[PDB]
Design a protein around this ligand. Structure first.
Ligand SMILES: [Zn+2]
Ligand SMILES: [Zn+2]
Ligand SMILES: [Zn+2]
Lengths: 187, 618, 586, 296
RNA sequence: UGACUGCUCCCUAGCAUGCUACUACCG
RNA sequence: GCGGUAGUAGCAUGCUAGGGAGCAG
């Protein structure tokens, strides 16, 4: 925009036009100064009129490929995270009782809604109110899914601890009520 | 249909996915490899690789969007709050989620009373508020599925009502498209369970290239992918306190239901003058053209809205299937057959029986639509046309055909019985004869289930077409709900339009020199939305002069109304925009040392702007 | 897909895909390398190619940006753009790059294809960054060199130590044994199964392997390739001597079974990288072993380049050292597990880089250095971090099979870094308590190459004898038998029985695998048997080549015995420099 | 969205290279930056060309434009150069007064707090500027006091004797009574509690504040917090009231301190009594005899 | 924690088309 | 003389994309 090729032609021709205005000679001097100027401007007609669209195209494409490199790093980040989640969530699969209950099936296919119900090693039961609390998780042990469970801790809404001494009928209406009992699998 | 019956008798801890321990790089996982639906029997995968040294990206995906790994690794759960068959649990502390109240917007309130609103006795009165909910609302709302029972549907008439519904959906066209022509507006909306820890749909719409998404979509046409699904609480103005809940499906379900259905979908939302009216604006005199197509010519019309109580949870499952079998009847060439089946089965495994994750704890969802998939607003429409037709067939058979007076509807009922029960295969001759009669004496118009039905009358008074005792009957025995005849109107007049459609009454104003049907809202609604906002930024008005403009665009047709205080709503809104502006301008002038110099904002506070949007020209 | 450039550290995104490893190239230096070479493909987040419908042209300079694709001359639409320009190819961060006058080295390593020793003069002689990238490309050249060998497919199983072994067509058969730790697999139908890891000999193909099996039909065996992975860490760290023995805890009492070993534990306790100039077999296997007790509170890592080289280090461990806090991982070749599997956090730890997790320590021992590659040292510096470092052995021994060397020899100090470091920076340490050799070879090494630091050790007990013979050579595929030496076996074994009960050292163990059929002395590869040698052996020259005729092959050959081995050094280099008695042919 | 310290002008700019990065005002901001080494400015957002991946640091070089900022090597041409007209564009673009007394203002901010001359320069300003100088003082102190290590004891020895090291290289503290080197033990993941100590020369003698034991690899610092800006004057609005009115001037004074009321009467008629009194000279007795001269 | 789909307003950016004048240069 | 075409502004239309907000099921 101030250092193009034909710029020099323009510079000489119009410095010469001004030298001619410095002398101030014929009208054919005007013929010169008016064919030179217009042709030298017919130069920049193209130089600083095309390269200025070239710079548009250049920097545009460059920024697009910048955005693309960004997306392509994001792909790597998400893959690494998903992968480590799988390879940390598998390790608790309990690979024993499972190992049994699969290797007995007709062929590997065993509906999902029984894998936890026969191999999980912790229950968590949610109770609305006392009157239902009795008809299940009473005492220190209950049975459900026909394995023998044993209570070991109770929380409530606000997530705190109550001792199983307190859940009577009288001390009931002071209990953030959806008590959440967390048993274990006893043999 | 049969399996739907013979599958109550068996136990319910043996439905759902299957699994099988596969070994990847000498490490064992569990992965789904089939399904067992209550209807479509057993369905086995087809591309299971008993080994692999490395999983790619498409793989990693379809293995982390599965229930099997999460469930099969989680603590058991017994849920005594519901009846729905719980399944497993993920956390160690369940989570109780609540909903906050609105925000008051005081300055609009004082300015509203100054003009003399809220005078005890008026006809406009606050009613739509931001209701709160306590802790366990999420699950006491999930619970409502226990209104969804296994239902057998009659069959020798479902296999006819499905012809006629298909005939309705006939002028359209559709097919599979490729992964470079799909269109997805708003690309920062959540991606559902396993993925929403990492980013919004954008990030999974980038990293997956175009041949990836194509490998994936032409992969689940010979496979089955069970999926999870969060459950969410809406937070929006309303007139009742039972919270609303909406199901946010996970990415790899949309990211293929799109490529499958997109073309038919976007070729319904671009046709004018049919039965369905999705995609037809009401501005610039669209509403008038709707209500003038409906009244097509039927000889002694009336009208007849209606409504289904609890629509998306009480829906049987046979009718959701039938919906998808009419939305996938266009691929006579793009897809083969076992391709069409594994696609249907992939739908049923994702949005009619999936594993709702309401809370921090998977469950099981018996049936009925999930209202957040990628083809609701049309599935509901075709189910709706289903109910309308079958009410017609009941209404036409169940008539003492010895007293019928004509001699053409007599033979119509005769051959209706023949072709209904005494036949096994189609008869497109008579399907056409019927659908012609049915659209000459029962025009309709159907958004996503808010219908209007300009029935001829002196028939429906001798039971030659539906009525509304007939929709009562049908809803009863085929959907199991009672349609209380107190939310179903019947304008006996037409110079006034429909008492309510899309929740908007209709006034026959006389503008220009001719008569149109502007559609006005509900004064309390507009006022309420003025006063109660979410967030303290909605509050301050000057920042958001862009709401009051839209609200005034919606509160305009009240100006022509007869009752008074209505019109004053509009003028309140205009004066309020004026105050907002001419105060902001000077306000910013002081702390500045200049401000607004070039206006034509003055168009915002005079009605000749807002009037353009209800005269037909753009 | 972004990163530093391998020359300018200037953040870039250009990949000189004309090389094999595709290094990251700064814009300006990407010019510099595309100019004076045939590197005429550079990839960015795409490949630079005129992706016209059915074009092909691949030249950065020759390519013109066109719209959004790329084009050369006959493709560009009217609006185009010289990709090549300004001495700065068009890649991200065009405005941030430092250039570098240092380019001829890169042009070299890209052009130099690893064939002569001058190549290795290069590898040792450049920048840490550039020799690192070098060593990586080196390994690339090696994986294209060696997997360019046939697939040892035994079609028929004769017995034990003799099999009918076949290969693919034309793809050459490897030489012999140790440089070729084989690992075969058997077909099933659609896939492959295990067979075992072997060491390969001819017949009928006699073998003496590392593992076994029930060998069957089509049993194919390979020198399995891998993937040389980037060498992020350097090879060595720049050291310093510390003002104190910090990071380590001084002891006061110490067992002086090792005298001049505490004197060097002290100097390594204050200096990071270090190494002893101690001859072959001089109680280095007692040095760091006593060090382990020297600072009874330091994390030591025991390693060498080969799992069968950590023999001695693994023996006396559970003897000198306590038995508890010692550990060495064994990958599923079977190695010495007299330590324990999977136990990083144990005060004493061992193993070789071929299998060990990322860690960090304080003191580092590394045997088997004369045959080390800068690629390995790089691995070491990448796997752990410590405060001081000890590399065990001496440079002046045998180097690894620098097989792509087909001309000039590689000099010792030019093997890896420590090599040039121990003569010009000098020996950080040295062992002189040379409890191994008699009086002959101690002064021989000292005034021969081993810089006159080892004195007369013990007595000349008379058994190594030498002649002035000749011996005629013969060859085969890639080994050498020598009948004018296999006859000389018995021809010398005549006069005294103190020869017959020995081992038969050999350059190319075809000669031993054949002459053991006559007598029966063991097949031994001269490569890596140091520490697994007998105090009384026999050696025969068998070949008069540089593989025998250097200056450092015989210092790893006469050190092996105690005071006795047949030194027939008829080869025409080292003869009238060492002195023995010359018993004529009898 | 507050005021610069010498123009009572709400502004919204924030100098680049400073301590807290203080509030500055358009022109006044200029008179701060253009007279020292400040080379960037932060506002509601910071001033940097948001052409993706661009890298621009001096405000001057930027230009505004569309609803964003840009830069010469990245901009659209339809610029609007920021650092223009002697006033860098930002909210309150007009109502600003600026000042020429800034290289003293700057001196107060542009004193590296190494010199007692810097203290003279903090003595060279006014109330807004002096509270400013004080907070800058505190901040430089605190960013130096955290230039030492974390006293990690690996091997426990006796009480007040251990085998102590540090992290890596980071310098050694003036180990006297200045530093209460409190410990934060490590158990599994978190840095939590060896307790509050005081370390001296051993074998390293510490001083356990509360009774405490020592562990392995667990270490000691003086973790810093956040000195915050103030408001009211350090010296009150001095006004010796016309009288000591509105109080309860009791008659009965404990006269053991016969110099006490001799100033109590002058203090009860004076806001701020900042007095010169030598140690143990009826001062510790002063206020507590005032407790009887004024029990109310 | 923030679902799918449709209509509508407002502010920037870009392209095209035309409209546009002032300069040119040629016939 | 009349047209040619080329650069420069100015206006309109339309399409694109990104941003803010509102309503309906
Ligand atoms: Zn299809
Ligand atoms: Zn100021
Ligand atoms: Zn910039």
């Amino acid at each position: 925009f101030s250092s193009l090729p034909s710029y020099a032609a323009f510079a000489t021709a119009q410095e010469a036009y001004e030298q001619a205005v410095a002398n101030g000679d014929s009208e054919v001097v005007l013929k010169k100064l008016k064919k030179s100027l217009n042709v030298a401007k017919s130069e920049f007609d193209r130089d600083a009129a095309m390269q200025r669209k070239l710079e548009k195209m250049a920097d545009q494409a460059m920024t697009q490929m910048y955005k693309q490199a960004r997306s392509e790093d994001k792909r790597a980040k998400v893959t690494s995270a998903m992968q480590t989640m799988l390879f940390t969530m598998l390790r608790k699969l309990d690979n024993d009782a499972l190992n049994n209950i699969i290797n007995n099936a007709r062929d590997g296919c065993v509906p999902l809604n029984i894998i936890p119900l026969t191999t999980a090693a912790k229950l968590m039961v949610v109770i609305p109110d006392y009157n239902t609390y009795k008809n299940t998780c009473d005492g220190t042990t209950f049975t459900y899914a026909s394995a023998l469970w044993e209570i070991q801790q109770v929380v409530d809404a606000d997530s705190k601890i109550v001792q199983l001494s307190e859940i009577s009928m009288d001390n009931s209406p002071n209990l953030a009520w959806p008590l959440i009992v967390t048993a274990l699998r006893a043999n | 249909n049969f399996n739907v019956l013979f599958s109550t008798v068996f136990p319910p801890t043996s439905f759902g996915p299957l699994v099988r321990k596969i070994f990847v790089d000498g490490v064992p996982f569990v992965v789904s490899t089939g399904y067992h639906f209550r209807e479509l029997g057993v369905v086995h995968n087809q591309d299971v690789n008993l080994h692999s040294s490395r999983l790619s990206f498409k793989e990693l995906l379809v293995y982390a969007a599965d229930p099997a790994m999460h469930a099969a690794s989680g603590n058991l759960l017994l849920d005594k709050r519901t009846t729905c068959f719980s399944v497993a649990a993920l956390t160690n502390n369940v989570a109780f989620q609540t909903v906050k109240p609105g925000n008051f917007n005081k300055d609009f309130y004082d300015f509203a009373v100054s003009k003399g609103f809220f005078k005890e006795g008026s006809s406009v009165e606050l009613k739509h508020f931001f209701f709160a909910q306590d802790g366990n609302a999420a699950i006491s709302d999930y619970d409502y599925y226990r209104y969804n029972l296994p239902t057998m549907c009659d069959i020798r008439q479902l296999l006819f009502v499905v012809e006629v519904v298909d005939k309705y959906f006939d002028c359209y066209d559709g097919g599979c498209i490729n992964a470079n022509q799909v269109i997805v507006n708003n690309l920062d909306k959540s991606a559902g369970f396993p993925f929403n820890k990492w980013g919004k749909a954008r990030l999974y719409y980038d990293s997956m290239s175009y041949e990836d998404q194509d490998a994936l979509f032409a992969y689940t046409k010979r496979n089955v992918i069970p999926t999870i699904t969060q459950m969410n609480l809406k937070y929006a103005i309303s007139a009742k306190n039972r919270a609303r809940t909406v199901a946010g499906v996970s990415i790899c379900s949309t990211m293929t239901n799109r490529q499958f259905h997109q073309k038919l979908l976007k070729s319904i939302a671009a046709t004018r003058g049919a039965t369905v009216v999705i995609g037809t604006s009401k501005f610039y005199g669209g509403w008038h053209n709707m209500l003038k197509t409906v009244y097509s010519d039927v000889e002694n019309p009336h009208l007849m809205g209606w409504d289904y109580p609890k629509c998306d949870r009480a829906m049987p499952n046979m009718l959701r299937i039938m919906a998808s079998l009419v939305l996938a009847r266009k691929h006579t060439t793009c897809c083969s057959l076992s391709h069409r089946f594994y696609r249907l089965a992939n739908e049923c495994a994702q949005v009619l029986s999936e594993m709702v994750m309401c809370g921090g704890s998977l469950y099981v969802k018996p049936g009925g639509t999930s209202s957040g998939d990628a083809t609701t607003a049309y599935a509901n429409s075709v189910f709706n046309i289903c109910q309308a037709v079958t009410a017609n067939v009941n209404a036409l058979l169940s008539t003492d055909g010895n007293k019928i007076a004509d001699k053409y509807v007599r033979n119509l009922q005769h051959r209706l019985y023949e072709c209904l029960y005494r036949n096994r295969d189609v008869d497109t001759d008579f399907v056409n004869e019927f659908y012609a009669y049915l659209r000459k004496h029962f025009s309709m118009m159907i958004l996503s289930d808010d219908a209007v039905v300009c029935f001829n009358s002196t028939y429906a008074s001798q039971g030659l077409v539906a009525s509304i005792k007939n929709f009562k009957s049908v809803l009863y025995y085929q959907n199991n709900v009672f349609m209380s005849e107190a939310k179903c109107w019947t304008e006996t007049d037409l110079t006034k339009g429909p008492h309510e459609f899309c929740s908007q009454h209709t006034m026959l104003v006389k503008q220009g020199d001719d008569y149109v049907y502007l559609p006005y809202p509900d004064p309390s609604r507009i006022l309420g939305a003025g006063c109660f906002v979410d967030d303290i930024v909605k509050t301050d008005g000057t920042l958001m002069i862009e709401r009051f403009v839209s609200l005034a665009i919606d509160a305009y047709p009240l100006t022509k109304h007869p009752n008074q205080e209505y019109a004053d709503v509009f003028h309140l809104y205009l004066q309020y925009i004026r105050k907002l502006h001419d105060e902001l301008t000077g306000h910013m002038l002081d702390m500045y040392s200049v401000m607004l110099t070039n206006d034509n904002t003055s168009r915002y506070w005079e009605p000749e702007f807002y009037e353009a949007m209800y005269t037909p020209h753009t | 897909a972004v990163g530093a450039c391998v020359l300018c550290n200037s953040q870039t995104s250009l990949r000189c895909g004309a090389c094999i490893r595709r290094p990251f190239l700064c814009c300006k230096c990407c010019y510099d390398h595309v100019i004076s070479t045939s590197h005429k493909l550079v990839l960015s987040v795409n490949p630079y190619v005129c992706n016209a419908p059915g074009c092909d042209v691949t030249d950065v300079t020759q390519l013109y940006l066109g719209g959004m694709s790329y084009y050369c001359k006959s493709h560009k639409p009217p609006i185009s753009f010289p990709l090549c320009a300004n001495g700065q190819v068009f890649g991200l961060y065009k405005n941030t790059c430092v250039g570098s006058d240092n380019v001829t080295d890169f042009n070299a390593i890209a052009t130099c294809d690893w064939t002569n020793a001058g190549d290795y003069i290069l590898a040792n002689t450049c920048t840490e960054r550039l020799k690192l990238f070098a060593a990586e490309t080196l390994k690339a050249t090696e994986e294209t060199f060696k997997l360019s060998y046939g697939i040892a497919t035994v079609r028929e199983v004769l017995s034990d130590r003799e099999l009918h072994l076949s290969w693919e067509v034309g793809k050459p058969r490897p030489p012999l044994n140790r440089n070729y730790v084989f690992t075969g697999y058997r077909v099933t139908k659609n896939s492959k199964v295990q067979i075992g890891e072997y060491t390969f000999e001819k017949g009928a193909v006699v073998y003496r392997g590392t593992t076994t099996y029930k060998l069957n039909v089509g049993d194919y065996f390979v020198l399995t390739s891998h993937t040389v992975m980037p060498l992020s860490a350097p090879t060595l760290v720049p050291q310093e001597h510390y003002v104190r023995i910090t990071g380590l805890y001084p002891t006061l009492n110490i067992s002086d079974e090792f005298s001049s070993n505490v004197a060097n534990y002290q100097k390594v306790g204050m200096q990071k990288y270090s190494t002893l100039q101690g001859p072959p077999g001089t109680g280095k296997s007692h040095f760091a072993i006593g060090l382990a007790l020297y600072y009874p509170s330091a994390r030591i890592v025991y390693t060498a380049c080969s799992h069968a080289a950590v023999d001695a280090l693994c023996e006396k461990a559970l003897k000198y050292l306590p038995i508890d806090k010692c550990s060495r991982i064994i990958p599923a070749v079977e190695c010495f597990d007299k330590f324990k599997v999977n136990s990083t956090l144990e005060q004493y730890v061992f193993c070789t880089v071929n299998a060990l997790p990322e860690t960090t320590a304080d003191i580092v021992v590394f045997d088997e250095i004369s045959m080390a590659t800068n690629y390995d040292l790089s691995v070491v510096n990448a796997r752990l971090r410590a405060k001081h470092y000890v590399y065990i052995g001496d440079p002046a021994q045998l180097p690894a099979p620098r097989t792509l060397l087909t001309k000039g020899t590689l000099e010792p100090e030019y093997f890896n870094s420590v090599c040039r470091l121990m003569k010009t920076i000098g020996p950080d340490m040295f062992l002189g308590t040379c409890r191994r050799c008699p009086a002959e070879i101690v002064d021989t090494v000292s005034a021969l190459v081993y810089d006159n630091k080892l004195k007369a050790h013990k007595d000349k007990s008379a058994q190594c004898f030498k002649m002035f013979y000749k011996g005629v050579i013969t060859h085969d595929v890639s080994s050498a038998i020598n009948r004018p030496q296999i006859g000389v076996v018995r021809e010398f074994l005549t006069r005294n029985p103190a020869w017959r009960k020995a081992v038969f050292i050999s350059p190319y163990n075809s000669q031993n695998a054949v002459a053991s059929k006559i007598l029966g002395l063991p097949t031994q590869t001269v490569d890596s048997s140091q520490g697994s040698e007998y105090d009384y052996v026999i050696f025969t020259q068998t070949t008069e080549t540089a593989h025998s005729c250097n200056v450092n092959r015989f210092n790893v050959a006469i050190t092996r015995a105690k005071v006795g081995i047949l030194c027939i050094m008829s080869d025409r280099d080292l003869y009238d420099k060492l002195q023995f008695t010359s018993l004529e042919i009898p």
